Amino acid sequence: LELEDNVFLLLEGNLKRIFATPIGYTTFREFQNVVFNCANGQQEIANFFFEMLINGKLTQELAPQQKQAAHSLIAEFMMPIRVAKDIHERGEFINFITSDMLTQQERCIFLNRLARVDGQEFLLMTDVQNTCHLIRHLLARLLEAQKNPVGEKNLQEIQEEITSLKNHFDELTKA
Amino acid sequence: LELENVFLLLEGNLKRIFATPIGYTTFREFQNVVFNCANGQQEIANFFFEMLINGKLTQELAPQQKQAAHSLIAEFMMPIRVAKDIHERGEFINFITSDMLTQQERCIFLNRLARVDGQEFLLMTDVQNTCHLIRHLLARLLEAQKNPVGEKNLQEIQEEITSLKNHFDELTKAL
Amino acid sequence: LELENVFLLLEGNLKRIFATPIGYTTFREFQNVVFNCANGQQEIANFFFEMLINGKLTQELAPQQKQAAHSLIAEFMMPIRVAKDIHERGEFINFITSDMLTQQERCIFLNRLARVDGQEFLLMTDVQNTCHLIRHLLARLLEAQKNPVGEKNLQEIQEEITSLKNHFDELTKAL
Amino acid sequence: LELEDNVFLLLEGNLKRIFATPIGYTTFREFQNVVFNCANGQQEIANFFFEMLINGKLTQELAPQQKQAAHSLIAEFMMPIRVAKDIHERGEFINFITSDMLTQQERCIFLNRLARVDGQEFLLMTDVQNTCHLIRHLLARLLEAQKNPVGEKNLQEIQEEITSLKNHFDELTKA
Amino acid sequence: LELENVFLLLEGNLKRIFATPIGYTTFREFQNVVFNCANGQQEIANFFFEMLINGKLTQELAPQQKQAAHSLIAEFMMPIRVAKDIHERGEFINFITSDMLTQQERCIFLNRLARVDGQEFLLMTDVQNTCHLIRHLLARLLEAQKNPVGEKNLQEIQEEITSLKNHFDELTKAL
Amino acid sequence: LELEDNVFLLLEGNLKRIFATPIGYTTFREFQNVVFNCANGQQEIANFFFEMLINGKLTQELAPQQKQAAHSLIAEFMMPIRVAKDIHERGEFINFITSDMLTQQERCIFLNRLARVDGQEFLLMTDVQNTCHLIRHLLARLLEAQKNPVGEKNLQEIQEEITSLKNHFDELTKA
């Protein structure tokens, strides 16, 4: 492989540009387009940068200044690229939830925040009854998954986590 | 009370403010409209509020005015009530749907959460995510139980908690 | 069938769910409302569904009930149909507008894309962007043509494709 | 120019802060305000940092530790600043589009994603007929640009790209 | 003019386009609907536009058609006017609310800004933020005063400016 | 404290991941969860990383390679973490506003952009009268704050900034 220093520099500027705005569902494909543009029709060069930037792996010896630049690109871009790829694949999946209990009047309510893999969040208020209905709805859904052969195998994989839920619930009912 | 074609002018104004999505300012924009149509007079405004919020006519009206009044009530009472609801509790959960899908040996759920204000959020969960969400929400019920107000709330929904019992039983047993 | 003031209670409930923007949960929220007004009975629910979805009364009603029924049909049949449309195809394109502007020696277009669900997106393009978008979309038609199902779809719209012909002709010739 | 090391440090913290959240339409102006605040009414200091951070150019010799810090600031912030400036100028222009063909039933449809320079994206579904109508609409718009003297010159600039579109289309029609 | 059940077909179509939130394309979508119902004829379209935009019937109609026409006017004239307003000035401020709260020795305000298009934005300010915003806006009035057009605008609102005077007086004096 | 180099590496990857998407209201809590996971139930390790990453302070001597990694983590993540914490606390507060005056026809209007601490922005158009009404509304709000003991103390703190507003306004009225 014969690369000029200029390629690493141009590639860095282009990657800095695409990652300057929020990662979205087009970002992984936009990154691939940047690599292909840089490779200029040379599959071996494209693959070199994909291995480097997607896998953090250097598939040939580089001269010291280029090796340093590759390490810098890996450090700066590997995770954001993997997150772009993740969003492309499963950006709408739940990633995190927070809840803050507020006690007002007679009533205990929760300010819940739902965050997805793609970073979008949603605020949702629930009182204690809403919370119970939400739990029942989600349990009803696992019970339907359990009838299906795939769902059944998925549930058997976390059988310990399920038995625990029942524990926590038995703990709530006694009190 | 003494009133002019106030009903038609009230109508045109209510049609305008309700032609766009109802928001958190809409109930107050409505009050401002009523105030303006009453020329600021509190007795007349109150007559309109009773009519429009509670559907109650506090005064006999000539046939033509009475016809317009019943029309305003049919057309606006519920949207006004929803605007007040949103002002008060717009961020609370209102509805949830889930569609079960099977992708790559995984049972997954496309959930949609809708609030009182009509905003919705799409959230994907797999079986393990669903279990974690349930654990999270259960923990909130436990948190409420430790707070004197929340504990009273829980005591009011015994039939709700028993329902969670039977679902938890069915799931654990079926595995 | 035996029915109570069910029409008025149905009305108030439909007015409430349609007072906020229609979303992807709205058709299902409607079904739940009908179910609840029918006290769960499938024959009564079906009577309401025929009435409200298809505008068909499957039963003679006293004058007062019949009046309320025609009113529910006029007020809700189309919003119900749109809610079902959105549930099914809410993300599909519905309308596009373009306004041509001239800025700094450039012809530019302010495009607005609107979906079946009513969400809109503003997108600016210059002449070269517009050309690239067209090239992209053309490539999709070529992609569909390589798929046996897509190829059948294309064969159904011969008059559409000829229209593209005449536009392409006019443009190339005029340059 | 007489700068204390403290200025580079304070400037870095302030820039890190403003770039911690998504770039928006106010971000370039917010950056200018940070520079002016740091310059403290000294135009020569403001200009030094603007040349450095907007143009990547150092307009006077710096001592080695400050030169290193300037290079670090350039590497970290030059591209995001240029993107902020770009968004300020043309954030609503199209930047990228992806499409995924889905074959279901009899029908080939495309899940399109529209991304703007500002990073916002929009999902749009199209079937084969929608795609054709979109193409015709966009061609109609170029034809109107062609009547206008500016638009005509813009089109002559990409005359080769246009002739190519016609090619791709002639290729689609034969098949 | 010669017309068919055009009123009912017009009705169903208007009900459909107004069933979703009004957007920036809605007025144009309406015009397209009218065009299509008129079978493209400009005289018939104009009859519908007068009826639907201005509430004016430019033609005597049989009792049944006349009834349908008055119904279309009552149901759609205002939403059409709002759609045109939005097309023209959707981003302009329409309403603002503020609720004053006290948190941690601070007086704070929960402000909500609503535009002509119905979109809203929540914005918190403390006392100093509120002062800065006011200073900003005052500076804009000063900017307009330096522009010959803006200076004319200011001269038209003398009673508005005096109101700012009395408020400014009350505040400074009370401190 | 006995940490393996692997901990710094794992921690960096996890932080890079969470900061790859827009900071939101859950991000500070997500960061705490990452630290606790890394500490693996060891409060002293959690506190070491919290002091390091929240306060930029190293609470024990590290070997040179680990000290270098800690400095790198501080440089990369301290500000974004502080911004996450800020958003958690006051993300909805105003952060910045820009205005651009547009002169069209007889009329001077302003394209205002409102940016919050959380990075969300809102575009709002105002003409000269809207601007005056907005000022009056905000002054009315400060006048109400002045009646309240807390608000009064807040206002006394910026008494100089208030007197200045009055100045700028007196300057506008003379002209």
Curated annotation (Swiss-Prot), chains B, C, E:
This is Protein CPn_0803/CP_1068/CPj0803/CpB0832. It holds the Pfam family CT_584-like. It comes from Chlamydia pneumoniae (Chlamydophila pneumoniae). It comes from the Bacteria. Belongs to the chlamydial CPn_0803/CT_584/TC_0873 family.
